[PDB]
Amino acid sequence: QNTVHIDLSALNPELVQAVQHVVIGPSSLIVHFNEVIGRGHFGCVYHGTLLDNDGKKIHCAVKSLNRITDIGEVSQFLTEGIIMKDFSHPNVLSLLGICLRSEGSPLVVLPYMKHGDLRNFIRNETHNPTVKDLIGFGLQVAKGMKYLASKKFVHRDLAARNCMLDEKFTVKVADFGLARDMYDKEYYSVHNKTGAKLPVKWMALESLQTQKFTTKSDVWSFGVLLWELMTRGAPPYPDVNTFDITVYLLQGRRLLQPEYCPDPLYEVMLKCWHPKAEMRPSFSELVSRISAIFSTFI
Numbered sequence: 371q372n373t374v375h376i377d378l379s380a381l382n383p384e385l386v387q388a389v390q391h392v393v394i395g396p397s398s399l400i401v402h403f404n405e406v407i408g409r410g411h412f413g414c415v416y417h418g419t420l421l422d423n424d425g426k427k428i429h430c431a432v433k434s435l436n437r438i439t440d441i442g443e444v445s446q447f448l449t450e451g452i453i454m455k456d457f458s459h460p461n462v463l464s465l466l467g468i469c470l471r472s473e474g475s476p477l478v479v480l481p482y483m484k485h486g487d488l489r490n491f492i493r494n495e496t497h498n499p500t501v502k503d504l505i506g507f508g509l510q511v512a513k514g515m516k517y518l519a520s521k522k523f524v525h526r527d528l529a530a531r532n533c534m535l536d537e538k539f540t541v542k543v544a545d546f547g548l549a550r551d552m553y554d555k556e557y558y559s560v561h562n563k564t565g566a567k568l569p570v571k572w573m574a575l576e577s578l579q580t581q582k583f584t585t586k587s588d589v590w591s592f593g594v595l596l597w598e599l600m601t602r603g604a605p606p607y608p609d610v611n612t613f614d615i616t617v618y619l620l621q622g623r624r625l626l627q628p629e630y631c632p633d634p635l636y637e638v639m640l641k642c643w644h645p646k647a648e649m650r651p652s653f654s655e656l657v658s659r660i661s662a663i664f665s666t667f668i
């Protein structure tokens with residue numbers, strides 16, 4: 371549609387062609403602004419009712435971006451997150467499209483997750499996840515990161531709070547690309563010189579020192595995610611406040627083994643926490659080490 375040139379006239383030409391491939395007509399989307407499912411730094415996430423080509427009314431989550439005041443920053447956000455339109459994996463949150471509107475902000479359309487984020491699903495005292503069920507979640511997250519890493523994409527915010535569960539209990543890595551924001555305002559430290567939002571208790575040791583993220587720092591973060599699942603959503607490093615983490619990790623200290631974490635899986639965690647990033651296993655090694663531990667549960 372030609373609405374891109376008008377409603378997003380601050381976009382680089384090549385990005386105009388990119389976002390044009392994923393535009394949703396306003397007649398296809400019903401945004402339930404009175405049914406807010408959550409908030410965030412960049413804006414709110416509402417309920418949605420998308421209508422596909424055949425006519426299926428699909429439940430979706432619509433992310434508002436009205437809090438980004440600078441209209442040039444909106445173009446940068448779409449510039450950094452448009453690549454996600456090329457991602458199609460069962461364990462990675464797909465992108466349904468973008469609804470554009472001048473005198474307003476572009477609406478990002480994501481599919482709805484019935485059981486919310488993975489952390490609040492396993493912390494909830496009403497659900498009963500067996501040890502095997504929790505390792506199944508970790509295996510799916512490793513499958514999603516194996517795909518993302520294969521696309522040379524760095525997540526730099528991988529945590530149980532950023533993974534989701536659909537109706538069939540399929541885990542989907544999220545909080546990346548156009549769906550990236552800050553939804554838990556207690557775990558992130560804002561850099562006063564660069565503005566980057568850092569999950570310090572999830573970043574690799576080398577990431578805390580130089581502020582860079584590779585495909586090995588998400589392996590470290592994936593280690594926290596496996597620790598969270600075993601502890602059913604306990605806060606990592608509870609006795610170490612955010613200024614001693616870096617010194618805590620330089621001595622070689624790591625997270626203790628959870629009371630119900632099988633020894634082979636903890637071994638996978640320490641591998642993710644190698645001080646040398648090049649010694650950590652790839653997400654393809656993780657998808658074979660964890661799947662083997664998950665298959666012993668027959």
Ligand SMILES: CCN1Cc2c(ccc(F)c2C#N)O[C@@H](C)CNC(=O)c2c(N)nn3ccc1nc23
Pocket residue numbers: 407408409410415431432433463480481482483484485486487531532533534544545546549550553
């Ligand atoms: C924009 C996409 N987001 C936002 C979102 C969150 C929380 C954690 C996340 F990694 C993401 C992401 N990416 O929002 C939080 C305020 C709460 N989000 C939800 O309860 C939610 C749901 N039940 N389905 N569903 C689908 C998508 C979706 N959020 C949800």
